[PDB]
């Protein structure tokens, strides 16, 4: 619904990287993989976390 | 639910001990100790040292079911040599080589930048 706090599998914090990841794509124009590796998410387990997040809360916030 | 609390993996119920030591019937100068609220971390380590001891005739451990944090270690030794003595000898070495290693490390880390 919202970035998860850590990689389910390794524990790395990943919940402090979502705003940046998204800034890194739309503001500095990197392809998703280059952007991930810039946030230091280099094992495929963490990469999967950000790359396949879906921020549903952004929809949930539209209701009154 | 029917899930046993997680604390049960490291913390002794009422009435339980760290060790129970029992004589083994099968062969001489043998013992079986059951360790509670422990698992492989200890169990493979005590074990593997017991085997660096040449008065150690047998050593082996197992966790009989993965649901319970308990292991069972069987030491057999040469005539005259108490197995509980072989397990002080072996827990002793352990502590000593680690001793060692936290020092070799605390060192190597001020030799260090970043």
């Amino acid at each position: 619904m919202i970035v998860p706090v850590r990689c389910f599998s390794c524990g790395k914090v990943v919940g402090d990287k979502w705003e940046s990841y998204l800034n890194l794509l739309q503001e500095d124009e990197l392809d998703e993989g280059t952007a991930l590796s810039r946030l230091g998410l280099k094992r495929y387990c963490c990469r999967r976390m950000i790359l396949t997040h879906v921020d549903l809360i952004e929809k949930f916030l539209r209701y009154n | 639910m029917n899930a046993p609390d997680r604390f049960e993996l490291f913390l002794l119920g009422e009435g339980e001990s760290k060790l129970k030591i029992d004589p083994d019937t099968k062969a001489p100068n043998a013992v079986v100790i059951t360790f509670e609220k422990e698992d492989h971390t200890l169990g493979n380590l005590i074990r593997a040292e017991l085997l660096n001891d040449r008065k150690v005739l047998f050593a082996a451990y197992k966790v009989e079911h993965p649901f319970f944090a308990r292991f069972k270690l069987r030491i057999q030794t040469t005539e005259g040599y108490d197995p509980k003595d072989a397990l002080k000898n072996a827990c002793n070495s352990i502590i000593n080589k680690l001793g060692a290693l936290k020092t070799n490390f605390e060192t190597e880390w001020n030799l260090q930048t970043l």
Partner: protein, 263 residues
């Protein structure tokens, strides 16, 4: 200093790559495990919810609060709540943190873990503080509000071990390798046409001599040298994941000598 030998090759606030040298696989593996499972650490483990008009449910939020890593350098000097003589919690067994947020702005207001206020007496032990490692010093995103929405909470942290719930774990991944060439033949490589074309060379191979095709297999060799790399989440600095890691084992094994003595 004779015995098990160390050899850091990199270090960083966050990771420490090293090489253990002159030790058994078991003690190596054991230290790996301890670092993963049994180093004490501090983590939200109770959450009272005064108000949540958020779009997330409470246990969803709670769960997320248990996961925010909290400073833990001085955690030996916090007693486990279950050893303390207080009724429930207090300042010897617990930090208490507050969280209030209100979606004041029109646009969407984020709640981050810097918005966590400690509310209890620390006795100047360095614990409790939300850890912060992003450029903006937000740390972790906890929630999001809309204009009109509210969330007020208290939390209690408590000392704990990842065995009991991973939130309490300090370490994150732990690289661990040995014998990169395969000399020990501890593994047997799968392949279609050629084993060496088809498997990638470990970085750890440089550090070690390739074998020579003549050399008949060495039955006596053992596993003596290990390539590790411990990565910290941050509640505990790294060197300290190891040192407390070695130290926790050493206490495990001493509780075993103490209880032969009591037999």
């Amino acid at each position: 200093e004779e015995g098990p030998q160390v050899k850091i090759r990199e270090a960083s606030k966050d990771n420490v790559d090293f090489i253990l040298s002159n030790v058994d696989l078991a003690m190596a593996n054991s230290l790996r495990r301890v670092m993963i499972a049994e180093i004490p650490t501090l983590a939200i483990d109770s959450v009272e919810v005064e108000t949540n008009t958020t779009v997330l449910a409470d246990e969803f939020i709670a769960h997320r609060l248990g996961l925010i890593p909290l400073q833990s350098m001085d955690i030996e000097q916090l007693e486990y709540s279950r050893d303390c003589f207080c009724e429930d919690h207090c300042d010897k067994c617990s930090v208490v943190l507050t969280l209030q947020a209100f979606g004041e702005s029109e646009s969407t207001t984020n709640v981050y873990s810097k918005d966590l206020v400690i509310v209890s007496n620390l006795m100047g032990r360095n614990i409790g503080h939300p850890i912060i490692q992003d450029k903006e010093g937000n740390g972790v995103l906890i929630c999001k509000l809309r204009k009109g929405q509210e969330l007020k909470l208290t939390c209690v942290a408590k000392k704990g071990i990842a065995k009991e719930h991973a939130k309490w774990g300090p370490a994150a991944a732990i690289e661990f390798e040995y014998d990169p060439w395969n000399k020990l033949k501890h593994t047997d490589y799968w392949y279609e046409q050629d084993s060496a074309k088809e498997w990638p060379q470990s970085k750890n191979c440089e550090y070690e001599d390739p074998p020579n095709e003549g050399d008949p297999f060495d039955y006596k060799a053992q596993a003596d040298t290990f390539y590790m790399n411990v990565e910290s989440v941050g509640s505990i600095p790294v060197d300290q994941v190891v040192v407390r890691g070695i130290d926790t084992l050493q206490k495990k094994v001493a509780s075993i000598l103490l209880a032969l003595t009591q037999m």
